[PDB]
Design an enzyme around this catalytic site. Structure first.
Site, PDB file in Angstrom:
ATOM      1  N   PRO A 132      -1.862  -1.052   6.686  1.00  0.00           N
ATOM      2  CA  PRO A 132      -2.456  -1.510   5.382  1.00  0.00           C
ATOM      3  C   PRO A 132      -2.308  -3.045   5.288  1.00  0.00           C
ATOM      4  O   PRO A 132      -1.366  -3.613   5.826  1.00  0.00           O
ATOM      5  CB  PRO A 132      -1.663  -0.766   4.346  1.00  0.00           C
ATOM      6  CG  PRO A 132      -1.257   0.411   4.995  1.00  0.00           C
ATOM      7  CD  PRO A 132      -1.145   0.212   6.453  1.00  0.00           C
ATOM      8  N   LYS A 184       2.231   5.443   5.385  1.00  0.00           N
ATOM      9  CA  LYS A 184       1.959   4.768   6.618  1.00  0.00           C
ATOM     10  C   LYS A 184       3.291   4.183   7.128  1.00  0.00           C
ATOM     11  O   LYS A 184       4.159   3.864   6.350  1.00  0.00           O
ATOM     12  CB  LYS A 184       0.969   3.618   6.429  1.00  0.00           C
ATOM     13  CG  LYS A 184      -0.408   4.000   5.968  1.00  0.00           C
ATOM     14  CD  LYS A 184      -1.344   4.588   7.013  1.00  0.00           C
ATOM     15  CE  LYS A 184      -2.775   4.704   6.332  1.00  0.00           C
ATOM     16  NZ  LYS A 184      -3.892   5.071   7.231  1.00  0.00           N
ATOM     17  N   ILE A 234      -7.324   1.925   6.343  1.00  0.00           N
ATOM     18  CA  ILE A 234      -8.167   2.973   6.863  1.00  0.00           C
ATOM     19  C   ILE A 234      -7.825   4.311   6.212  1.00  0.00           C
ATOM     20  O   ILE A 234      -6.660   4.683   6.062  1.00  0.00           O
ATOM     21  CB  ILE A 234      -7.977   3.123   8.389  1.00  0.00           C
ATOM     22  CG1 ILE A 234      -8.335   1.819   9.117  1.00  0.00           C
ATOM     23  CG2 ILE A 234      -8.837   4.299   8.915  1.00  0.00           C
ATOM     24  CD1 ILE A 234      -8.114   1.843  10.567  1.00  0.00           C
TER      25      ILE A 234
END
Lengths: 117, 117, 117
Positions: C1, C32, C64
């Site tokens: 990120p 993440k 993503i």
């Protein structure tokens, strides 16, 4: 709307209160209430614009609905160029703008997204 | 093209004239005339990259047509990594790039949009 | 990120180590690994948020897969608002977030793009 202005003018050559005047100008130009307008000014940066490091400024404008067509953006650009050339004492060849449409699911506001408000 | 480089290197550890050399490198890499290349450097920021606050840099590259595929961007990335690692005295694990395609109706230039020029 | 935080708080009113705590918070919120989280803080800027130049902050979050729906972003927003209000001593009406999905062909990493890693 979300406006972001990068400039290589030092902070002491960006007139006091620019962010407030840009906020009011944006509200008028984009047809949005002034309490929905956001402005960020980042001065004193190292910049080249059109290959040249003379004073310059880059403006980014992001909004829902009103910055997504050439014909809308042509109008907006004229007004924002008029505003910035006068405020920053720049010629039109020393300013560039980029327009970015946004959607409500992208905007986090009061701990949720605009979708739910 | 529009290049934006954020770094946690202080301004006095970003070699003088980087913005000018990056502008010329970008013109060569992206195959665009140098008088269409724009560069903004924002040093002295507080940054973590890959979880770490060691020196680092983030580059954003926006352009029409030439940054929209993996195979184009793979090539571009190699060149920009080569440039920045040497200039900023960083290893490749301390730089990240993000590529953003633009369309002419998004670019405000001389008071209109590129669509009409 | 990729997180980017602009604020009109001076650097000496942004708690030391914010970028590191935001990196760990983002890893937890977005699910993440922390070694894939990037944070950039740009303090001392001139800003208006919702028409007002009182202290404020703008956060941009790009990733993503995980920032592309209203329902995902509603959850993320709640957590990031909680984090920033406490860290920056701001009310919720003084923070806005913008979410931006990314694709692997956009990310230049180690001289290639994430597509090929």
């Amino acid at each position: 709307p979300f406006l972001e202005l990068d400039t290589n003018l030092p902070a002491n050559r960006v007139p006091a209160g620019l962010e407030k005047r840009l906020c009011a100008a944006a509200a008028s130009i984009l047809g949005k209430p002034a309490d929905r307008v956001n402005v960020t000014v980042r001065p004193g940066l190292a910049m080249a614009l059109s290959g040249s490091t003379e004073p310059c400024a880059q403006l980014s404008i992001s909004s829902i609905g009103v910055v997504g067509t050439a014909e809308d953006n042509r109008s907006h650009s004229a007004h924002f160029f008029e505003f910035l050339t006068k405020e920053l004492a720049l010629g039109q060849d020393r300013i560039l703008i980029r327009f970015f449409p946004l959607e409500s699911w992208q905007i986090g506001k009061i701990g949720t997204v605009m979708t739910f408000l």
